[PDB]
Amino acid sequence: AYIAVPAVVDSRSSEAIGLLESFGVDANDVSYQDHDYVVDQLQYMLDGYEAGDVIDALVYRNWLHHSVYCLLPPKSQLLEYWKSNPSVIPDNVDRRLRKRLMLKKDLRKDDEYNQLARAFKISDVYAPLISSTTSPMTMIQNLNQGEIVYTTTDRVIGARVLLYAPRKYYAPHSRFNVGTFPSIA
Amino acid sequence: QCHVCSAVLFSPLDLDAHVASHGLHGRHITEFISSWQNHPIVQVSADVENRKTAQLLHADTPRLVTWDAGLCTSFKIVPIVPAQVPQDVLAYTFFTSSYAIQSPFPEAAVSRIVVHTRWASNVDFDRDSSVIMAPPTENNIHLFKQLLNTETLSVRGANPLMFRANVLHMLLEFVLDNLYLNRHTGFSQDHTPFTEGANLRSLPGPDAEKWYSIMYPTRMGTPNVSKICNFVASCVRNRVGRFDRAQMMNGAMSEWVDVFETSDALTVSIRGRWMARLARMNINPTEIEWALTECAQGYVTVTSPYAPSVNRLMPYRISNAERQISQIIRVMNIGNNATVIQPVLQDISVLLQRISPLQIDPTIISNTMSTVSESTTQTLSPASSILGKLRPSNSDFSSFRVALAGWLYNGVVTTVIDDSSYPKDGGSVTSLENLWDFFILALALPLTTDPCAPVKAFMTLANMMVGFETIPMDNQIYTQSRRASAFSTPHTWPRCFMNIQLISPIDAPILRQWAEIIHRYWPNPSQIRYGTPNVFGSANLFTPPEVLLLPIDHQPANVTTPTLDFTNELTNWRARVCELMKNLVDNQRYQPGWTQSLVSSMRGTLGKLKLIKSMTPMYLQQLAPVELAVIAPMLPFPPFQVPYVRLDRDRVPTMVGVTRQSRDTITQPALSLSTTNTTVGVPLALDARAITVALLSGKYPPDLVTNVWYADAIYPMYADTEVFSNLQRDVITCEAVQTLVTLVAQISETQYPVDRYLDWIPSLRASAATAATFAEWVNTSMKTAFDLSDMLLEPLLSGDPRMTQLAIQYQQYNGRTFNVIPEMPGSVIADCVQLTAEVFNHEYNLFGIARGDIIIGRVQSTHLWSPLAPPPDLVFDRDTPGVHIFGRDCRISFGMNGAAPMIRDETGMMVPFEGNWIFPLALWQMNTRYFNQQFDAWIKTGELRIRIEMGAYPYMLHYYDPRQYANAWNLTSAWLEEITPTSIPSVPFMVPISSDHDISSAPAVQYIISTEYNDRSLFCTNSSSPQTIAGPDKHIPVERYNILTNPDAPPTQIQLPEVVDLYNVVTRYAYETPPITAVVMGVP
Amino acid sequence: LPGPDAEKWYSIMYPTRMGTPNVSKICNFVASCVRNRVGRFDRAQMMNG
């Protein structure tokens, strides 16, 4: 069960406020979600896009299918991180491209690496991928499928954003749940 | 060590503990021992403190064989208002010793029969369902308020609308307390001068002389003049103790005897029926070894030695019909819950991996395509594309073996290839990646149990070819570019697919070839034999009872076939798909924009992929159906298959439902939960990637010998079988189904006519919420009686349990259905409940229920006539002249200015508060606290006499001294004040105490009397005196002790429905129950 | 019917359920009517549960 209230709900603080007897409801099984970050995320979300796409995307999202984002450095630092100390390269990679990455002291003079790197796309390895041109509807619609979503940009709405690389390369339910956004799904 | 089953045991002084299991006279469930290794396997019950490297059985088996060493009676005789008399001769003197006089019956002024079932009993594992009744001075009303008046206005009473359900449920408990087997015990010959030379039985306990007077009434002689000493003098002497015995023995103890002891004819009839049901069920180890030889598909033999003995009782053979009913219940258990079938399929998916010789090693693909590299200049490459798509580093092949396990269970679950294994948003054969995606898809499609997989295989390429070659469609809204994932149902198959000639080769040559390859070389279904008929039954329906139909043609299993065998169906399929792919690439009619010429590299990496060495298509046709058919009988949820077709939308199943009602009745259409699925069962998704790489890469061990591998893999999983418990569970499941459909139909209205014995007990036509909680209360009683913590009878409760007969059906696409109605055999608990209802019809008194009705009216007399057997003066009925019958609309008008207040009868006339009336009890329950205001001053003093017609009522007695004053108003008015609209307290009677000598006459005031005769419960009055002068007179009932007092009566004869007999002829047994042993011998 | 206090709606909602003690006008009306016209008399049960 999931009901929605017209107030910002955090799990650790709005229980101390109570926040549900404050509307007039006598009251365990009532577990509070943390919708603190989605309001600031919405405020950062509204300055780029329009209103209606953002709201009508956020409306169609259930708050029980638990999931998370993933944010990665764009292309050059993405290949540079695979060049670096971890060889944590996924199995989707090109057989020649990982072979050129497992060597030492690559540079601009390597034509054989650069020719393949200039035709390499992130969308070949990672799918589904949120690029900056994607609609906000398809972000949440792809998010409701597979419990992790790869992105390129910060400006997304929904669950929590976690990062893929170190920052040097970048530029639990119960029966009754409350929240602050009515779901439709 | 043992020379029978070759068991190696170390100490030569506990060898009797082993060879007692072979039937040789010198705990475990089953005991197998192998023939090639020193490793026996022992299976033990699931409540243990340790294990000696012993395995368990996680099967909720019932307790069928339970033993009873005590008396097989359920009625007892209690003393009530006791007394003593002065007597003549007090003891027996032999030389100097004195033996006191013991009596078979309590010496009291009044004694009457109550019911306390298993009151002289020495069982192990009591059934936990007793019927305990206090003597009728105490309150016996807690039995009838048991379930259905859980909410009640008054806790000190019982609901009269629920009398039928409560009495019927305690008849069920009275049956379920008598499901035991009588136990043989030791005897003791005596030489007392009344039981000379008989062989009396001694109960198991420290004392033996204590029970002899209770069991054997003729042993007490005739010392003086009494009613008991008159009865025993009327009895006979020869029939006492053991009648005869068996011929076969073990030493000095014979196998079965019969004795003449105090018992119940009803109880020994119930135990005889329960004896015959278990006797119709056993099996011998010759048939055990036949079934375990035939079930093992000839890869291993089995033998089970045993000595000849009639003592064997191993109840395992059941009929074929009961497996089907248990299968229907286990199907109704699911109810579109994805949770309850995931550990059914994942578990068999692990077990097939542990049995299978096939080692899926994906490095074969990498070894074939590591030599294929490309130049440093050009970008896009097919050999690197297929490896980046297949990803042979990942080694999780669960999607292969879940698909192999799903062949046994279409109808409850169907497997489809998941979305995001199709080409992304179209597919467009110009693209390089989508060709490999089409290949990986179309090679993995023939293994799902999906009836529309060929249409999905066709429409994937039809989506990819949009813009290059067109096919006709029908209705201008299902365009060629409609996604192949949507073609999930038989009503979406187009006309262009079903008729190949509409696809013109001048327009769509590759679509024409791709339709033709599907219509020719798609794999054909087949069937294989398994299990055993004539042992283990057959739990399938819609199929013949021995065949296992699976969508692949199978072959007889050898090993040395050619790898590149194109007679093999799946290898033929891979070859045809690769041939059409290299027909597609060859011309470059479809791929502009390729700046290089990738036709050579593509055709090379298709040629290296077609003739790959892979033992998976050989395995899936030679050894995989064998491994399915071996483990298929051992499963807890046995397979449930719906027939496979191909390319034929006239026999495609679309819908499976379970019909609950009967056949010749028209009710609300209550479709089951399982009919609300888009496909035939629960949709299950699979990854085509790990099916395809598992097909492409698979090998055997390099010293694979089948007669060693399978004889070693079959043994530890047959050594932990539980089919022998799952056979015993299904008797209880079918019996619970029959018990519900009889006992709910007793109280509701339906069209299941069975004999309708008790009707005079009132009730209401129960609706669904009442019948469902009654049926839940039947369920939780049967599970308590049989020690069942698993589910049983619970899927028949979500909804309407007013049911008649279970059935299950599916429909095919063209509208025709197939209806399987599993017929029923005889049920034992149901018709034993019917038998004890027939007994209760005549002996309602002994359970504390009174029949008829009462008459509330003052009687001022000094007479002694015991108001449960009234004289015909005080009673009246609708035939009596001048009796007013009152319907529902009884209205009271008060009198004005000295007029009498009046009440309206049924015919409209107003009558004064005077005379003889007839209420129904519903009127007093409607207008309690109002009728209670006006009627009491007229009943207590005036001449108002009211007959409350009610049919059935509980009663309690209140004995009084008949030589003192007695007023029944303080009991009668206290009964009248407490009748609330939902309940009534038990009717208090004030009946006198009989005496020996004549007494003084005192006036007595009585208000409540009965109508008909109402004490068959009364046993004897003043059972120590010569005679009863004043009061109720009742001698010993001679008709209950039939076989003594009747000279021309055979000992077998009883009268069962009219009056139950005491002192019957019970046969006692002493059996063995050896564990299931087997020596498992491998086959060269 | 739901609500915070629902045990007094039934007397209002079913006039023919009341018992008939008196020759008061309510009890003259109620006992002069047809009994089997109370509560449910028709449903459409399309599925189990």
Ligand SMILES: [Zn+2]
């Ligand atoms: Zn042995």
